[PDB]
Design a protein around this ligand. Structure first.
Ligand SMILES: C[C@]1(C(=O)N(CCCC(=O)O)Cc2cccc(Cl)c2)CCN1C(=O)c1csc2ccccc12
Length: 278
């Protein structure tokens, strides 16, 4: 009861804290465009904002669930659409954050290439690759898993045979769409921070802060969910703390705003104006 209510209120907080800041971020980038940005970084970040918006706008469904002890029964189609809605955002975000890690390292360190390739169009493909990879692979999940008065919004008994097909797919996504980005993100930022270490204080604090946020996201926000998938092999059963792990997956949407503040000064100016009003 209260155990459920807490997640409801936490999700409301995430919604009511996130959505305004994310809309302000979206507007900030739309502002930062001025003449459509020449910078590949600013495009990739915009995609993350859209991926966040996609999640945050669909987030309220969860607060409604948490009230009703996951009772209200949704059609299998609706259940699938909402599930796909979530999956897309997370695994898109991971590759985008990896793309940012690439961008900062390759951009700042070894700047000769960045001086020549300061055109925006070379960047756009990375966002499209992230979207295509996310959508394309995530679709497989809902294909496989989809085509009574129990306390479950979507009870996932599946089938004993299907289990043997389903879990490998979840592990495949877990590995390729997270554990690989993880290996890239840390490899880039470890160097980027070293290069930055080797206005200056502001640049340093921005650069470190950026890396801290990206690291934190993978461990705190995305970690437990992707661990919970892997535990699937050990237990051969959906862990009870999946619903808890999901909280963290949503939490990212609250901390992603900071990324934009640390990255782009225009966002700091825009939030400055927003804070001036508020
Ligand atoms: C919550 C969950 C899901 O879809 N379930 C959970 C099974 C039941 C269990 O065991 O609690 C069914 C479900 C949950 C909710 C709505 C529908 Cl219509 C169907 C699992 C990750 N995920 C989403 O992809 C997700 C979908 S909307 C959304 C919003 C925010 C975060 C994540 C999500």
């Amino acid at each position: 009861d209260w155990k459920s209510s807490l997640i409801l209120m936490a999700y409301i907080i995430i919604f009511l804290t996130g959505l305004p800041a994310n809309l302000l971020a979206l507007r900030a980038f739309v502002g930062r465009i001025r003449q459509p940005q020449p910078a590949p970084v600013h495009i990739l970040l915009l995609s993350l904002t859209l991926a966040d918006l996609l999640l945050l706008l669909l987030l309220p469904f969860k607060i409604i669930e948490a009230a009703s002890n996951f009772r209200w029964y949704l059609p299998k189609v609706v259940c699938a659409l909402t599930s796909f809605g979530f999956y897309s955002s997370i695994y898109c975000s991971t590759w985008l954050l990896a793309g940012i890690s690439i961008e900062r390292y390759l951009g700042v360190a070894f700047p000769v290439q960045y001086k020549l390739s300061r055109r925006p169009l070379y960047g756009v493909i990375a966002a499209l690759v992230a979207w295509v990879m996310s959508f394309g692979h995530c679709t497989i999940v809902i294909i496989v898993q989809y085509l009574s008065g129990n306390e479950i919004t979507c009870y996932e008994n599946f089938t004993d045979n299907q289990l043997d097909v389903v879990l490998p797919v979840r592990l495949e996504l877990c590995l390729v769409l997270f554990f690989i980005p993880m290996a890239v993100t840390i490899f880039c930022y470890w160097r980027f921070v070293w290069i930055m270490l080797s206005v200056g204080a502001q640049r340093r604090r921005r650069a470190v802060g950026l890396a801290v946020v990206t690291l934190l996201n993978f461990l705190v926000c995305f970690g437990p969910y992707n661990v919970s998938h892997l535990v699937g092999y050990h237990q051969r059963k959906s862990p009870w703390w999946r619903s808890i792990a999901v909280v963290f997956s949503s939490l990212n949407a609250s901390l992603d705003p900071l990324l934009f503040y640390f990255s782009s000064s225009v966002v700091r100016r825009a939030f400055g104006r927003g804070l001036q009003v508020l």
